[PDB]
Scaffold this motif. Sequence first.
Motif, PDB file in Angstrom:
ATOM      1  N   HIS B  50       0.956  -1.089  -0.020  1.00  0.00           N
ATOM      2  CA  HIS B  50       0.093  -0.051  -0.183  1.00  0.00           C
ATOM      3  C   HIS B  50       0.819   1.200  -0.040  1.00  0.00           C
ATOM      4  O   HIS B  50       1.950   1.190   0.468  1.00  0.00           O
ATOM      5  CB  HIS B  50      -1.131   0.188   1.155  1.00  0.00           C
ATOM      6  N   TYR B  51       0.157   2.347  -0.164  1.00  0.00           N
ATOM      7  CA  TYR B  51       0.876   3.774  -0.244  1.00  0.00           C
ATOM      8  C   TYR B  51      -0.006   4.374   1.126  1.00  0.00           C
ATOM      9  O   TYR B  51      -1.312   4.392   0.877  1.00  0.00           O
ATOM     10  CB  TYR B  51       0.645   4.388  -1.406  1.00  0.00           C
ATOM     11  N   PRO B  55      -5.004   6.346   1.723  1.00  0.00           N
ATOM     12  CA  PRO B  55      -4.284   5.163   1.453  1.00  0.00           C
ATOM     13  C   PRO B  55      -4.919   4.159   0.592  1.00  0.00           C
ATOM     14  O   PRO B  55      -6.280   4.489   0.343  1.00  0.00           O
ATOM     15  CB  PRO B  55      -4.632   4.696   2.700  1.00  0.00           C
ATOM     16  N   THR B  56      -4.229   3.684  -0.211  1.00  0.00           N
ATOM     17  CA  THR B  56      -4.703   2.479  -1.483  1.00  0.00           C
ATOM     18  C   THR B  56      -3.586   1.558  -1.512  1.00  0.00           C
ATOM     19  O   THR B  56      -2.844   1.731  -0.962  1.00  0.00           O
ATOM     20  CB  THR B  56      -4.870   3.490  -2.571  1.00  0.00           C
ATOM     21  N   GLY B  57      -3.846   0.458  -1.953  1.00  0.00           N
ATOM     22  CA  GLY B  57      -3.148  -0.788  -2.219  1.00  0.00           C
ATOM     23  C   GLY B  57      -3.583  -1.536  -3.355  1.00  0.00           C
ATOM     24  O   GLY B  57      -4.392  -1.584  -4.058  1.00  0.00           O
ATOM     25  N   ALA B  58      -2.524  -2.513  -3.457  1.00  0.00           N
ATOM     26  CA  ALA B  58      -2.610  -3.731  -4.390  1.00  0.00           C
ATOM     27  C   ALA B  58      -2.234  -5.168  -3.769  1.00  0.00           C
ATOM     28  O   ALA B  58      -1.526  -5.041  -2.973  1.00  0.00           O
ATOM     29  CB  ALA B  58      -1.777  -3.468  -5.605  1.00  0.00           C
ATOM     30  N   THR B  59      -3.177  -6.022  -4.131  1.00  0.00           N
ATOM     31  CA  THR B  59      -3.046  -7.461  -3.747  1.00  0.00           C
ATOM     32  C   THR B  59      -2.536  -8.399  -4.779  1.00  0.00           C
ATOM     33  O   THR B  59      -3.475  -8.359  -5.847  1.00  0.00           O
ATOM     34  CB  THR B  59      -3.968  -7.978  -2.883  1.00  0.00           C
ATOM     35  N   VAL B  60      -1.446  -9.132  -4.759  1.00  0.00           N
ATOM     36  CA  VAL B  60      -1.010  -9.870  -6.234  1.00  0.00           C
ATOM     37  C   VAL B  60      -1.058 -11.345  -5.717  1.00  0.00           C
ATOM     38  O   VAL B  60      -0.312 -11.476  -4.636  1.00  0.00           O
ATOM     39  CB  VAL B  60       0.294  -9.545  -6.550  1.00  0.00           C
ATOM     40  N   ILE B  61      -1.730 -11.922  -6.457  1.00  0.00           N
ATOM     41  CA  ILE B  61      -1.533 -13.465  -6.075  1.00  0.00           C
ATOM     42  C   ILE B  61      -0.867 -14.202  -7.482  1.00  0.00           C
ATOM     43  O   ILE B  61      -1.114 -13.931  -8.455  1.00  0.00           O
ATOM     44  CB  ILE B  61      -3.031 -14.243  -6.564  1.00  0.00           C
ATOM     45  N   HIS B  62       0.613 -14.722  -6.883  1.00  0.00           N
ATOM     46  CA  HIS B  62       1.562 -14.906  -7.904  1.00  0.00           C
ATOM     47  C   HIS B  62       1.810 -16.550  -8.003  1.00  0.00           C
ATOM     48  O   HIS B  62       1.483 -17.273  -7.020  1.00  0.00           O
ATOM     49  CB  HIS B  62       2.650 -14.495  -7.637  1.00  0.00           C
ATOM     50  N   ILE B  63       1.162 -17.073  -8.968  1.00  0.00           N
ATOM     51  CA  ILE B  63       1.125 -18.751  -9.412  1.00  0.00           C
ATOM     52  C   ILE B  63       2.245 -18.715 -10.499  1.00  0.00           C
ATOM     53  O   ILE B  63       2.042 -18.573 -11.838  1.00  0.00           O
ATOM     54  CB  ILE B  63      -0.228 -18.874  -9.780  1.00  0.00           C
ATOM     55  N   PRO B  64       3.699 -18.996 -10.368  1.00  0.00           N
ATOM     56  CA  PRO B  64       4.484 -18.800 -11.450  1.00  0.00           C
ATOM     57  C   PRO B  64       4.669 -19.822 -12.481  1.00  0.00           C
ATOM     58  O   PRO B  64       5.011 -19.693 -13.738  1.00  0.00           O
ATOM     59  CB  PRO B  64       5.938 -18.998 -10.570  1.00  0.00           C
ATOM     60  N   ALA B 140      -5.816  11.529  -4.793  1.00  0.00           N
ATOM     61  CA  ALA B 140      -5.860  10.980  -6.037  1.00  0.00           C
ATOM     62  C   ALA B 140      -4.842  10.061  -6.375  1.00  0.00           C
ATOM     63  O   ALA B 140      -4.556   9.631  -7.547  1.00  0.00           O
ATOM     64  CB  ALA B 140      -5.790  12.226  -7.107  1.00  0.00           C
ATOM     65  N   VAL B 141      -4.181   9.493  -5.268  1.00  0.00           N
ATOM     66  CA  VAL B 141      -2.897   8.402  -5.326  1.00  0.00           C
ATOM     67  C   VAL B 141      -3.478   7.372  -5.699  1.00  0.00           C
ATOM     68  O   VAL B 141      -4.660   6.719  -5.158  1.00  0.00           O
ATOM     69  CB  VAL B 141      -2.276   8.303  -3.964  1.00  0.00           C
ATOM     70  N   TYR B 142      -3.054   6.416  -6.769  1.00  0.00           N
ATOM     71  CA  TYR B 142      -3.468   5.280  -7.259  1.00  0.00           C
ATOM     72  C   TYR B 142      -2.343   4.305  -7.382  1.00  0.00           C
ATOM     73  O   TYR B 142      -1.304   4.540  -7.256  1.00  0.00           O
ATOM     74  CB  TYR B 142      -3.998   5.269  -8.607  1.00  0.00           C
ATOM     75  N   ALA B 165      -5.519  -3.686   4.099  1.00  0.00           N
ATOM     76  CA  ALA B 165      -3.918  -4.317   3.680  1.00  0.00           C
ATOM     77  C   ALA B 165      -4.311  -4.326   1.945  1.00  0.00           C
ATOM     78  O   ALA B 165      -5.435  -4.655   1.450  1.00  0.00           O
ATOM     79  CB  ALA B 165      -3.630  -5.745   4.245  1.00  0.00           C
ATOM     80  N   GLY B 166      -3.254  -3.988   1.191  1.00  0.00           N
ATOM     81  CA  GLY B 166      -3.383  -4.251   0.008  1.00  0.00           C
ATOM     82  C   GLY B 166      -4.490  -3.547  -0.766  1.00  0.00           C
ATOM     83  O   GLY B 166      -4.708  -2.448  -0.460  1.00  0.00           O
ATOM     84  N   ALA B 167      -5.175  -4.111  -1.740  1.00  0.00           N
ATOM     85  CA  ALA B 167      -6.428  -3.527  -2.149  1.00  0.00           C
ATOM     86  C   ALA B 167      -7.577  -3.442  -1.293  1.00  0.00           C
ATOM     87  O   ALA B 167      -8.347  -2.409  -1.608  1.00  0.00           O
ATOM     88  CB  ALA B 167      -6.910  -4.640  -3.472  1.00  0.00           C
ATOM     89  N   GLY B 168      -7.628  -3.928  -0.222  1.00  0.00           N
ATOM     90  CA  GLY B 168      -8.639  -3.574   0.699  1.00  0.00           C
ATOM     91  C   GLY B 168      -8.246  -2.323   1.701  1.00  0.00           C
ATOM     92  O   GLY B 168      -9.141  -2.163   2.480  1.00  0.00           O
ATOM     93  N   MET B 169      -7.300  -1.719   1.420  1.00  0.00           N
ATOM     94  CA  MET B 169      -6.803  -0.626   2.454  1.00  0.00           C
ATOM     95  C   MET B 169      -8.223   0.360   2.596  1.00  0.00           C
ATOM     96  O   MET B 169      -8.364   0.794   3.683  1.00  0.00           O
ATOM     97  CB  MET B 169      -5.781   0.204   1.754  1.00  0.00           C
ATOM     98  N   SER B 170      -8.598   0.737   1.351  1.00  0.00           N
ATOM     99  CA  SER B 170      -9.982   1.704   1.430  1.00  0.00           C
ATOM    100  C   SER B 170     -11.073   1.170   0.763  1.00  0.00           C
ATOM    101  O   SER B 170     -11.978   2.141   0.282  1.00  0.00           O
ATOM    102  CB  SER B 170      -9.367   3.041   0.863  1.00  0.00           C
TER     103      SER B 170
END
Lengths: 329, 333
Positions: B50-51, B55-64, B140-142, B165-170
């Motif tokens: 997050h920033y 407050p805003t964020g991203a959540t990444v599911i990584h499946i290599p 306007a932070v994204y 947390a992550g995408a759920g921050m806001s």
Amino acid sequence: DPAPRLAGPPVFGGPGNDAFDLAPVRSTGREMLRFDFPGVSIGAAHYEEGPTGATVIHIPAGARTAVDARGGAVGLSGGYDFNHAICLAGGAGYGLEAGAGVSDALLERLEYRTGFAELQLVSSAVIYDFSARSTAVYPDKALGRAALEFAVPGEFPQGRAGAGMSASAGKVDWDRTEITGQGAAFRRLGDVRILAVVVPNPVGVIVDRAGTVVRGNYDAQTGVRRHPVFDYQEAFAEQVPPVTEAGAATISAIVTNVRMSPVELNQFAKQVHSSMHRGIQPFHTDMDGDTLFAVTTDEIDLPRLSVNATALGAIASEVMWDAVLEAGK
Amino acid sequence: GIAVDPAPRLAGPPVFGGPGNDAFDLAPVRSTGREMLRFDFPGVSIGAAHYEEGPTGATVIHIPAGARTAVDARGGAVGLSGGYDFNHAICLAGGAGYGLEAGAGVSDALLERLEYRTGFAELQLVSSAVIYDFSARSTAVYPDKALGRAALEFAVPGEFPQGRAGAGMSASAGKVDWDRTEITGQGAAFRRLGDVRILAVVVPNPVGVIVDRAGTVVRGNYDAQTGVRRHPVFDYQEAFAEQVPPVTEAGAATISAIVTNVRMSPVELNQFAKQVHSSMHRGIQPFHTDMDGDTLFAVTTDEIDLPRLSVNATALGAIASEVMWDAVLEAGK
Ligand code: NA
Ligand code: NA
Ligand code: NA
């Protein structure tokens, strides 16, 4: 003819974006189409380091849009029913980043207003253009921003320009694949305006109205282009696996000023997109990522089933065929 | 067995005229949320960044390895990039359509990890979905390329940060009237049954409210004048009875993923996706509205075979639906 433009074999292990201080270049192509369409601007930028590029259609007022995506390999972002810009780019899925550069530049232009009705909507589509060059350079945020900054009303750079820099056709065998380009065509009929933009990167070949194969699947051993169906039918006749390379798409837009309901606009999009199987053959295959945007500025009211969408669709289909032939020229 | 906090967390009105990303020296923060879910699913990692300035964020599911995916998108406000039938990562983010840029950061990082190999079979495929979270804060932070890259760099096997947390921050719920909108969060849940593994991840930013298995509204549409939450249908039916326009704010979505190790054909996986996504109308009400951009990713790692219509997809779908309801309640807790 025309004269061959074989892409030739890619050299593997080529450098990517991190290797360069990438300098956006305003794409001018082989010639400039000039047209009159108030409220629509087009910009095209490329990296010589690819070569690869992006083409941006900017409609600052926003325009209702239908998206028609076909094939097994579509690369699309947003696909919104209302857009301030359409961004077409090389670099496969990596080039969708060019649309983020457009989005971010539009947000900055709106002084960072973020009310829902103020959101700046950019739909992006891509072609895989990595086999047609020996680098891994992709259109990035900076290149999308550049294409927007370079956008002007009433001009389109034909040929190797923007997203068309490294587009190619005819991919039964890469040894017969030829560079295409991007193309546009424009018609005005009374107050009705139709603009077609296309970046043909198909597995198929470009075909003219006489049925002549004019770009793609050129055999250096014979000096002749072949419709792919002849290659496929001989593979089946000989009972050997057919071959075709992955990394293909045609990404396109029709922009009109005719008011159409959401249903009309979607039916219009599907009709025009299907019509492109005349000029690109085969088309809408599992190997392709074909994406057409139908955009209306909703300026002209023409005088349950829509004759107007059907008639406009038939005309727009011809404008799009002309755009495909400009890309292959 | 999820003990949702009865206390209100009203979002409150924004202060607008807030600046955008380049007004700040933005440092990605690893999101730890309120609690860590620990789960046993080798091959699946989650990162959340997050920033604070959002407050805003991203959540990444990584499946290599890459995993077969079905996408089920509903409502009139979907924000989706890629939507591929095969993904190396799923990126969920705030910042409305601007936050799709986080997925470009993930894509670019994966390409760099592959030493810029660009064979078609080597393409690194990231699907991204977004929530509009600008009414829940002023700036306007994204989520941008750097934040997507950070979320991928922070990805840990078998952990998920619950809550803000992550995408759920806001993220927020219950948008008949913004005065009654409450912050949600993101949520995850996991079940193992024999060798079957099911992970649910959700970022509920709905116009509707979160509802528990007893039918109690537990997050969203909290009326500070009465100290209780109620179902939006009470607000809608009162508007129609009074013959005044109904109201509801734009800027809503629930973005979610269901990851399983059970082999499913493309048809099975798409049917499974539609079933699980519809099931979420139990825990989020209303759901799949024209105001919502609801996007569910159903992902299979194709590791195990269960022993023309699919009983296996139907049965797995029923169990995954319960895992997803638990994830929604973790987000609302
Ligand atoms: Na505003
Ligand atoms: Na390669
Ligand atoms: Na696998």
